[PDB]
């Protein structure tokens, strides 16, 4: 179980002087999703190439999914999977786009009905609001739940804006049977935001059971 953030560990939005829009675009409407697809190519040893078409509304037809190691890529290379993640158009090597993790086995992973997960949001130690996200997967990546949670917060609580964020710090915590892990929601200090390096935290393809996962979001103000 990952230790909770220590004092001063979380990234402070005030120490990031670049455009927060670069963070915001990762969690806006434009996300990559595909159902029951099998990898067609391999750029490197730890990535998989998929033929995901969203050419009607999206603007990327081939996507490279990068994993933490060779074992993850081997596990899903010849299997039909579902893909869900936030895409980094910035630059990889491989129009085209890239992402990290967000891959789950398709067979046997669907529920009949959408399952609701209640997100509990805290601000400065006191709970702010609670809201539901939905998934129809028995096993869901933390990335998909993280995207759904932040997409709601962007649309409804202005979590990220074009210039800044109204919140100084933020981390999202997933709890599964007294075992927990968390992600920092704020960009690293500096005047540039490296989208690819940030999204790399998803490359472990971490999965949780949608039945009993609990999501908590902790925010602080300036």
């Amino acid at each position, epitope marked *: 179980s990952q230790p909770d953030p220590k004092p001063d560990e979380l990234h402070k939005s005030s120490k990031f002087t670049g455009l927060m829009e670069n963070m915001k675009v990762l969690y806006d409407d434009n996300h990559v999703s595909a159902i029951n697809v099998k990898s067609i190519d391999q750029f490197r040893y730890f990535d998989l190439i998929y033929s995901i078409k969203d050419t009607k509304l999206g603007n990327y037809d081939n996507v490279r999914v990068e994993f933490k190691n060779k074992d993850l890529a081997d596990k899903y290379k010849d299997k039909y999977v579902d893909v869900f993640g936030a895409n980094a158009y910035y630059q990889c090597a491989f129009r085209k786009t890239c992402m990290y993790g967000g891959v789950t086995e398709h067979n046997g992973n669907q529920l009949d009905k959408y399952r609701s997960i*209640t997100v509990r949001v805290f601000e400065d130690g*006191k*709970n*702010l609001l609670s809201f539901d996200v939905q998934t129809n997967k028995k096993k869901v990546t933390a990335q998909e739940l993280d995207y759904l949670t932040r997409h709601y917060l962007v649309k409804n609580k202005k979590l990220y804006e074009f210039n800044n964020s109204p919140y100084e710090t933020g981390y999202i915590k997933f709890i599964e049977n007294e075992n927990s892990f968390w992600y920092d929601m704020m960009p690293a200090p500096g005047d540039k935001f490296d989208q690819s390096k940030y999204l790399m935290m998803y490359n472990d393809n971490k999965m949780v059971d949608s039945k009993d996962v609990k999501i908590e979001v902790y925010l602080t103000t300036k």
Partner: antibody, heavy 124, light 111 residues
Framework: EVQLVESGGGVVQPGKSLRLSCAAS????????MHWVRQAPGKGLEWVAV????????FYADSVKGRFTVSRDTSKNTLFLQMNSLIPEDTAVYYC?????????????????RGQGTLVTVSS | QSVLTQPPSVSAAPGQKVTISCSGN????????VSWYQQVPGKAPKVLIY???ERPSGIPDRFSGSRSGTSVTLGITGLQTGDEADYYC???????????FGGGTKLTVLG
């Protein structure tokens, strides 16, 4: 712009029943939970009930539990409050209020009343 | 009487500033963010503050909110005659599974 219009109030004998309606417009009704709040003449605000956006949660004030029921119809965009065994202490102006954000669950730390309310008077 | 506690009344001259306190339990205010509502005499209540400090659109920055432990405070500066109203604090109570209001504070702008 969001509009809430309460209706159905009137003079009622004690022990009788009355049904209130709140017609909603200007937002996707089924995405938002809804609240009822009342105010007796010259007294403070008192929260009555909430129904969640999907209707699965219904919570009531202790003073109305077992007598009032919140219901909801998506097709006519209407919130209802069925009031049974009315007592003179139920005399109040009743306001409906919408959840600020979609898909909310407890805690509801604020509500957004937008109507003029409807007056119900329970007197013999 | 009332689950949340606020003073019955407060008053000051136009242009002055006032504060209205609101105190509760570990079950409501020590747990949750608080909202404020103003009700001009004879009119309907409307949201004035939410998330303990945020203002809805149309509410000027003369109105502010703050928190100190198990109590919260609403601040009004540059008092105007139109500010004369009843003010209510509100929040969720997890013990009662209800939103609870204070008893209300009557603000008079002294004329």
């Amino acid at each position: 712009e969001v509009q809430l219009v309460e209706s159905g109030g009137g003079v009622v004998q004690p022990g009788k029943s009355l049904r209130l309606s709140c017609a909603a417009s200007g937002f996707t009704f089924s995405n938002y939970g809804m609240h009822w709040v009342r105010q007796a003449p010259g007294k403070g605000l008192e929260w009555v009930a909430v129904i969640s956006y999907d209707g699965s949660d219904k919570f009531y004030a202790d003073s109305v539990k077992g007598r009032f029921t919140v219901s909801r119809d998506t097709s006519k965009n209407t919130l209802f409050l069925q009031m049974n065994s009315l007592i003179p202490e139920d005399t109040a102006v009743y306001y409906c209020a919408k959840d600020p954000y979609p898909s909310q669950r407890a805690p509801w730390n604020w509500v957004d009343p937008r109507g003029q309310g409807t007056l119900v008077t329970v007197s013999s | 009487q009332s689950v949340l506690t606020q003073p019955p009344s407060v008053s000051a001259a136009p242009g002055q500033k006032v504060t209205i306190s609101c105190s509760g339990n570990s079950s409501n205010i020590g747990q949750n963010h608080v909202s404020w509502y103003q009700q001009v005499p004879g009119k309907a209540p409307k949201v004035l503050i939410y998330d303990t400090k945020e203002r809805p659109s149309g509410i000027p920055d003369r109105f502010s909110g703050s928190r100190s432990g198990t109590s919260v405070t609403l601040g009004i500066t540059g008092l105007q005659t139109g500010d004369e109203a009843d003010y209510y604090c509100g929040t969720w109570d997890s013990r009662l599974s209800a939103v609870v209001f204070g008893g209300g504070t009557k603000l008079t702008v002294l004329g």
